[PDB]
Amino acid sequence: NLYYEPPCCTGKEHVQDFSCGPLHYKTFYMDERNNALYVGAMDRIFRLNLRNISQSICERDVLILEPTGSDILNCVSKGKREKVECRNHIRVIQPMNFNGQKLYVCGTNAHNPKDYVINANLTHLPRSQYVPGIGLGIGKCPYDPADNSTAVYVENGNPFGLPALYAGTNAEFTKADSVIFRSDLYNLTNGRKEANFKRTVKYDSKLLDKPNFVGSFEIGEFVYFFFREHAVEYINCGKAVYSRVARVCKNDRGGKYMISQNWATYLKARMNCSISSEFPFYFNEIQSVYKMPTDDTKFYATFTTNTNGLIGSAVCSYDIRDINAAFDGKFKEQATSNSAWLPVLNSKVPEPRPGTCHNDTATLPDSVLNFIRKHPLMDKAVDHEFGNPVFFKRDVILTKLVVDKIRIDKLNQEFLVYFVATTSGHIYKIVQFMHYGQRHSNLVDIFEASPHSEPIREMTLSHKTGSLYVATDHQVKQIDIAMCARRYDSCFRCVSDPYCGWDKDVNACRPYQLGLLQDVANETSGICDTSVLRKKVTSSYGQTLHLSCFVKMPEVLRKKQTRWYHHSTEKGRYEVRYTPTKYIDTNEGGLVLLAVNEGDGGRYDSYLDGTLLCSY
Amino acid sequence: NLYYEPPCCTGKEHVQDFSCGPLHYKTFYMDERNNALYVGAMDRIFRLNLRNISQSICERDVLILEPTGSDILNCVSKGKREKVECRNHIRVIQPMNFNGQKLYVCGTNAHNPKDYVINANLTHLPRSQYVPGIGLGIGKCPYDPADNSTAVYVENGNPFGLPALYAGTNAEFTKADSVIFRSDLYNLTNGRKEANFKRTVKYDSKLLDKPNFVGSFEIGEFVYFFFREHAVEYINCGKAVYSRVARVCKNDRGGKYMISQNWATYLKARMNCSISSEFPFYFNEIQSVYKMPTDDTKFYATFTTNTNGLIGSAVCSYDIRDINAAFDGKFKEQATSNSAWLPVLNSKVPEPRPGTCHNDTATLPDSVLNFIRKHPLMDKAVDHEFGNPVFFKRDVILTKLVVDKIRIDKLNQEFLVYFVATTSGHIYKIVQFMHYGQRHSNLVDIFEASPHSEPIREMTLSHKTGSLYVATDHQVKQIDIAMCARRYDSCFRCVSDPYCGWDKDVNACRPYQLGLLQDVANETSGICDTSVLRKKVTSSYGQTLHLSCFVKMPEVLRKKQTRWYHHSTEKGRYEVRYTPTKYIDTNEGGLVLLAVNEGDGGRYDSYLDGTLLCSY
Ligand SMILES: *[C@@H]1O[C@H](CO)[C@@H](O[C@@H]2O[C@H](CO)[C@@H](O[C@@H]3O[C@H](CO[C@H]4O[C@H](CO[C@H]5O[C@H](CO)[C@@H](O)[C@H](O)[C@@H]5O[C@H]5O[C@H](CO)[C@@H](O)[C@H](O)[C@@H]5O)[C@@H](O)[C@H](O[C@H]5O[C@H](CO)[C@@H](O)[C@H](O)[C@@H]5O)[C@@H]4O)[C@@H](O)[C@H](O[C@H]4O[C@H](CO)[C@@H](O)[C@H](O)[C@@H]4O[C@H]4O[C@H](CO)[C@@H](O)[C@H](O)[C@@H]4O)[C@@H]3O)[C@H](O)[C@H]2NC(C)=O)[C@H](O)[C@H]1NC(C)=O
Ligand SMILES: *[C@@H]1O[C@H](CO)[C@@H](O[C@@H]2O[C@H](CO)[C@@H](O[C@@H]3O[C@H](CO[C@H]4O[C@H](CO[C@H]5O[C@H](CO)[C@@H](O)[C@H](O)[C@@H]5O[C@H]5O[C@H](CO)[C@@H](O)[C@H](O)[C@@H]5O)[C@@H](O)[C@H](O[C@H]5O[C@H](CO)[C@@H](O)[C@H](O)[C@@H]5O)[C@@H]4O)[C@@H](O)[C@H](O[C@H]4O[C@H](CO)[C@@H](O)[C@H](O)[C@@H]4O[C@H]4O[C@H](CO)[C@@H](O)[C@H](O)[C@@H]4O)[C@@H]3O)[C@H](O)[C@H]2NC(C)=O)[C@H](O)[C@H]1NC(C)=O
Ligand SMILES: O=S(=O)(O)OC[C@H]1O[C@@](COS(=O)(=O)O)(O[C@H]2O[C@H](COS(=O)(=O)O)[C@@H](OS(=O)(=O)O)[C@H](OS(=O)(=O)O)[C@H]2OS(=O)(=O)O)[C@@H](OS(=O)(=O)O)[C@@H]1OS(=O)(=O)O
Ligand SMILES: O=S(=O)(O)OC[C@H]1O[C@@](COS(=O)(=O)O)(O[C@H]2O[C@H](COS(=O)(=O)O)[C@@H](OS(=O)(=O)O)[C@H](OS(=O)(=O)O)[C@H]2OS(=O)(=O)O)[C@@H](OS(=O)(=O)O)[C@@H]1OS(=O)(=O)O
Ligand SMILES: O=S(=O)(O)OC[C@H]1O[C@@](COS(=O)(=O)O)(O[C@H]2O[C@H](COS(=O)(=O)O)[C@@H](OS(=O)(=O)O)[C@H](OS(=O)(=O)O)[C@H]2OS(=O)(=O)O)[C@@H](OS(=O)(=O)O)[C@@H]1OS(=O)(=O)O
Ligand SMILES: O=S(=O)(O)OC[C@H]1O[C@@](COS(=O)(=O)O)(O[C@H]2O[C@H](COS(=O)(=O)O)[C@@H](OS(=O)(=O)O)[C@H](OS(=O)(=O)O)[C@H]2OS(=O)(=O)O)[C@@H](OS(=O)(=O)O)[C@@H]1OS(=O)(=O)O
């Protein structure tokens, strides 16, 4: 009996499951104050228990919202399969404050988007009660369930202080239309239409070119959108999908004359996630984006190269000041349909600067309006912090992600732990630290959060309960972000996790307290030299025995050299080289001793990349 | 004693060595009719024995050509280290027919290029004999030894039937100049200067932008150049190094008036080596190029992505008709310094078509001349055969290459074997075949041809002697292209090499004859099922024994699943799953049986990716 780490996480409890059948789950809303996680699904919305999702009943904690038969016949007549496509897949769940806190919901609805307003307890509003501007989600949530959309319900900052839903999706049956859209401005008390809707210019591929959204948030006086689209400026050289960030002013009221339903402050910028060199290596396609609830200045996202050819993913981090810096910089421009994309001199920019917020945007001169009409793309690409990714890996496709922040004050240490999903269903546990003034990282653990054939559709994080939440097509799993005792039974693996520390007095890994052993940055190698598992064993002559450290090698460690050393009194200190018979090497870093004898006995140390793992 | 393949190739003889010290060897010329391989080096040129390079003496088979002291003092005064930089490194060795067959030689010569004419027996010409147009290699071979240059001595097709040396290199001390150059045309009988020199327009980055040549040949009525340079058309999107092919007419006589020393038929085209998809994946940087001596219609080359970021190499094949098709297509154009690169309509092309050969090129109209002056780059990229590479591998940098052709007529099978060098000093043995109307490949073997820290500078192939020739900085090694008996002792490895066939009657691998076993395309799996090594062995109770197929797993096979099956009368047919004690898996695909007993005995088959390897 050697080192052994139990598998994770498919079958103290740290993994909780919930399932009412293959319901194509999607769309998260986490309310930490009420211990509820609202999860959308096909024709259903659930309200789960945040501390333990297994305590929710499929019948008591649900509110079915299946489409109407009139919309089903329309969808079948189009040519779409009625089994899943002509159903209602929820895509928007946002907090809404109308006569108290309620929920805003939106769904595909058999390729006919329709929104609702429901109470927190998953009960419809009184049928006699009317909802101003609700009933049709024409530009609020997509038609096709597979479409990547985004939205956020903003309360403050809009014109006249009214509420509205900023979103970005299709807004037509065919893929022709694609728009960043704001709903009609309604005063929900009196029900009067106080302002028309805002949307990107129709069929202007310079604004959006076959986009795929991954997230959207409200920060300061703006609303930001993260997505990937076809690179309009790369066309002269080839085909490429670039990642973009788009910014609009909350108080944007539109243009003049006939173009009042179009944005007066819409600007987008390419996002830079490359490796610093004379010839950078860009991860151009974004896959997801996460923001911490308490911090509105940092954004984390997953980027991938084109899924064809050689594949590589990467995680980049961006500051709000760097995003605003791109929107405050020069403007890209293509003079004619045959000109090259060149920057604009500051002398030609009209004032007020296009993109800057302004009460009543119709007051702006025709110069400013028509300038931003044909200059949506900023010349500068958004700079990623430190000029390099936080982590990257070859032949891996990374999707959703969630980031946590840890700080041990008495040692003055701050860590960032990234929980990145892979298309193979695994979650990468990646830590970030500062080693001698520079930023490095190290993949701590890899645990399976779903079978290979079941992708991860959505993922969120709860700092209060300290648990990770992953949604798939078949079920929803709750995973703790720290399983020190249940996972790490070795000092080697325990001291590398910032959540954990190795107690030498109880001989077990457990949550970190001051005084326990930990070295995440590997700045003090050999810390576990005294907590190493050493198992002296004398066996009979001739018979062959197996010396090993781990039962099965941990996933993140299998790609490290396992060098065995042997100190014998007659032979001395030397490194064991493998021979066809006596010295056999195992796939778990073990050492087999075929034909044991007198000269074999001695001190046996098993190093792993120059650091002791176990001894015999 | 199981399967065992001896290492290769660092220490019947198939590996022959030659070395007179670290002489920075480079530049090959293979004369199959005289059994001699002319190899350049630092201050020396050698004449080796083609059938056995070890039979050459460092003193009898050499002609030292070290620089003059006047040129050394110049080079030391520049600021270059006199140890290696201020020496003479040969870069051009070409056959020359003057009063019989002689050699043309060119060398760096302490950053002052100088050419010579020497006899085949490595003896200087009589000092009284003069050589027309020889003495200075200003545009004939580079200044810096590390510079990638190319050249070829063409005899027929030039104006007035005179000989000249087409080349491409620096032609200045600084990196400022870079030119495809033709020497002055001299009638070697009378010594009269019959025509001036030809060269690319100076400082025109549209023609060449920091190029790196990899080869050059004469085909038909043209002379082609293969190189990589900065992508002038990619500038509007970023930085990229593209691979180019350049074509000039042999009978090019220059322009009119003042621009007579410039080419009138110079055209270049980007080379396409990508993976076919909606979003192609380009291997943009070429590293070397090989042509078969008997075939002037096929070209093979190694391409790599940018060496920064994620790394990948690939091998592409091109037909002469596809190269000419690009030079016969539309023309790329950038109207202004701020325009985009667009094609030219055929209605605007002047006649005669620029680039087409014409006796006396000064006769062409000013339209044709000035057109090709500003239109050197063809719009079409040279298409690679079958639209995909022949082979590609991740995290490997491939350099020089040589290709052989095999044909077994009685079975109607034609193979192509690629011998591609890696920066780690290894040679990849890659075979190409047709499987159901389509082209596939499979890496047959990987053998070390040089230590890791010693790169491979040049490589050639001799069809007559059937041997491969690799040159490094320290030595020159001769390697046979087929070592069936000395390498393959297993039917599994023997039937995959097109050079080899497994004889079941002598139980050994050996050169292929009709009737022997072979399946390169894996179209008949299980062919070796009767030639499998089966070694029944009964051992004592309790003691642990090791079951294995290979002593050490062959390099090209280590990344394949090793599944052991066990048929016991009581248990039946099943796949052996590894347990922590009894069932141990070795890194060599073996199976260890800890604590042997009665239930363990039985038929033990060891499969490798669904094909039987060995049994017990
Ligand atoms: C190396 O070898 C490879 C293997 O053979 C080869 O692979 C092939 O790669 C392409 C991608 O490069 C694959 O995808 C195809 O792409 C085609 C090109 O589309 C894009 O480019 C269009 C043209 O843009 C150039 O030309 C303009 C006019 O001159 C310039 O203004 C541009 O600046 C640009 O110039 C550059 O390129 C020129 C051409 O080389 C060059 O002269 C110039 O100097 C400069 O370098 C764009 O119009 C187009 O944009 C449209 O579409 C996108 C979305 O796709 C929108 O965002 C835009 O708003 C705009 O609407 C692209 O950017 C496509 O034509 C082709 O599409 C057709 O086929 C697909 C098949 O699925 C259909 O889905 C599609 O509807 C098209 O069908 C239509 O046309 C066909 C043909 O007529 C017709 O049969 C059909 O009925 C229908 O009408 C496709 O997407 C291609 O698949 C790969 N092939 C293979 C076999 O794998 C690689 O290119 C080679 N590399 C080189 C360098 O040669
Ligand atoms: C994401 O983040 C990454 C990390 O921060 C970041 O990495 C950096 O990448 C660059 C490469 O992109 C690395 O290399 C540098 O490249 C610089 C650019 O050089 C090339 O581009 C020049 C300009 O071309 C653009 O602009 C023209 C004018 O507008 C247009 O006409 C062009 O079409 C093109 O436009 C495109 O780009 C615009 C800019 O973004 C954009 O507005 C526009 O819309 C369009 O998209 C070219 O002139 C230049 O070509 C010259 O040189 C090549 C050979 O290099 C020749 O073949 C040409 O004939 C021509 O002569 C390039 O194509 C370089 O300026 C920079 O060089 C300087 O520094 C190096 C350091 O080694 C020196 O060797 C060199 O001599 C230069 O020094 C000089 O300038 C500096 C600065 O003033 C000065 O201090 C010094 O004394 C000297 O005077 C360098 O090579 C760079 O290293 C990476 N940084 C890091 C930290 O790693 C990446 O770019 C980011 N991505 C994005 C999208 O932002
Ligand atoms: O010292 S501890 O904080 O770790 O707790 C003392 C012993 O509890 C165990 C299990 O015993 S039991 O829970 O009473 O059944 O560890 C377990 O408890 C800790 C913290 O206690 S708490 O009640 O759950 O709050 C858990 O950490 S935490 O997630 O709550 O922060 C352990 O989970 S984890 O892997 O650290 O994240 C949990 O371990 S387990 O998964 O149940 O096995 C003992 O652990 S054990 O004896 O090593 O098996 C603790 O004694 S210890 O040896 O010092 O670890
Ligand atoms: O393989 S070795 O030559 O390195 O010996 C290691 C094993 O022998 C023991 C037996 O200990 S005992 O039961 O108390 O007799 O230790 C003995 O050998 C070591 C040598 O290894 S070391 O790296 O030098 O320390 C001796 O060390 S030394 O005298 O050479 O300096 C041990 O003395 S010491 O306290 O380590 O300095 C010596 O034990 S003793 O003190 O003479 O009695 C085992 O070491 S143990 O775990 O401390 O008991 C070693 O394991 S084994 O299973 O017996 O192979
Ligand atoms: O049947 S064979 O053509 O292979 O030749 C008969 C036996 O010769 C050996 C070695 O015996 S020896 O050369 O007399 O010393 O194979 C060797 O000879 C063959 C061909 O004969 S030749 O004189 O060299 O032309 C070589 O093939 S070839 O390269 O010449 O085309 C063998 O080299 S290779 O690996 O096939 O390329 C060479 O094998 S070795 O490198 O010397 O070991 C016997 O091989 S052996 O007994 O298996 O060891 C041949 O008998 S065999 O069992 O049928 O192979
Ligand atoms: O592990 S198994 O149950 O599969 O048995 C395989 C080993 O037993 C032998 C002993 O042969 S003997 O010395 O001649 O006695 O073969 C015997 O077992 C096999 C079963 O394997 S198989 O895949 O079915 O063929 C018998 O086959 S069968 O009767 O089940 O159909 C052998 O008979 S047969 O000619 O293969 O059909 C049987 O041998 S015998 O004919 O009854 O005498 C060894 O096979 S051997 O190499 O042919 O001699 C097997 O190797 S072991 O080292 O003994 O483990």
Ligand SMILES: *[C@@H]1O[C@H](CO)[C@@H](O[C@@H]2O[C@H](CO)[C@@H](O[C@@H]3O[C@H](CO[C@H]4O[C@H](CO)[C@@H](O)[C@H](O)[C@@H]4O)[C@@H](O)[C@H](O)[C@@H]3O)[C@H](O)[C@H]2NC(C)=O)[C@H](O)[C@H]1NC(C)=O
């Ligand atoms: C904490 O930091 C320690 C100090 O840096 C780490 O120890 C180091 O571990 C590395 C990796 O094993 C050792 O690197 C050496 O690399 C050379 C070169 O070999 C290279 O090529 C081979 C063949 O392809 C390849 O297998 C190797 O991985 C290398 O890429 C080898 O000759 C050496 O044997 C060794 O591998 C350092 O030498 C080693 N330093 C010390 C002081 O031990 C330690 O692993 C870190 N621990 C953790 C948990 O992060």
Ligand SMILES: *[C@@H]1O[C@H](CO)[C@@H](O[C@@H]2O[C@H](CO)[C@@H](O[C@@H]3O[C@H](CO[C@H]4O[C@H](CO)[C@@H](O)[C@H](O)[C@@H]4O)[C@@H](O)[C@H](O)[C@@H]3O)[C@H](O)[C@H]2NC(C)=O)[C@H](O)[C@H]1NC(C)=O
């Ligand atoms: C000649 O052709 C035969 C027929 O094609 C080859 O046999 C085939 O070999 C492959 C590779 O072993 C087998 O592929 C299967 O793949 C599935 C899926 O597993 C995948 O994922 C795992 C985990 O990542 C990975 O390890 C695998 O490699 C796969 O990528 C597995 O479930 C199977 O066990 C097996 O691996 C074919 O099934 C197999 N076919 C047959 C009929 O045996 C043979 O290898 C070829 N021989 C030569 C010399 O080329």
Ligand SMILES: *[C@@H]1O[C@H](CO)[C@@H](O[C@@H]2O[C@H](CO)[C@@H](O)[C@H](O)[C@H]2NC(C)=O)[C@H](O)[C@H]1NC(C)=O
């Ligand atoms: C989360 O809630 C579920 C119930 O929804 C709990 O599952 C049961 O827990 C008890 C105590 O371990 C067992 O006796 C039961 O057999 C469990 N399952 C069933 C089907 O009854 C679960 O223990 C809760 N976990 C936490 C951490 O609160």
Ligand SMILES: *[C@@H]1O[C@H](CO)[C@@H](O[C@@H]2O[C@H](CO)[C@@H](O)[C@H](O)[C@H]2NC(C)=O)[C@H](O)[C@H]1NC(C)=O
């Ligand atoms: C190639 O030539 C070398 C000599 O230049 C040969 O090397 C010697 O060969 C004989 C026969 O095997 C040995 O007895 C010698 O000891 C070898 N070395 C020396 C230093 O004398 C080599 O055998 C030749 N190989 C072939 C295939 O012709």
Ligand SMILES: *[C@@H]1O[C@H](CO)[C@@H](O)[C@H](O)[C@H]1NC(C)=O
């Ligand atoms: C909406 O209308 C009410 C009167 O019905 C008014 O008091 C209020 O200020 C208006 N605006 C908001 C945001 O409620």
Ligand SMILES: *[C@@H]1O[C@H](CO)[C@@H](O)[C@H](O)[C@H]1NC(C)=O
């Ligand atoms: C400017 O915006 C403010 C926002 O509070 C608004 O009250 C005001 O009416 C707007 N116009 C002027 C002229 O201040």
Ligand SMILES: *[C@@H]1O[C@H](CO)[C@@H](O)[C@H](O)[C@H]1NC(C)=O
């Ligand atoms: C054309 O080229 C040929 C090549 O043999 C040459 O003899 C002839 O003088 C050239 N000019 C004409 C008009 O034929």
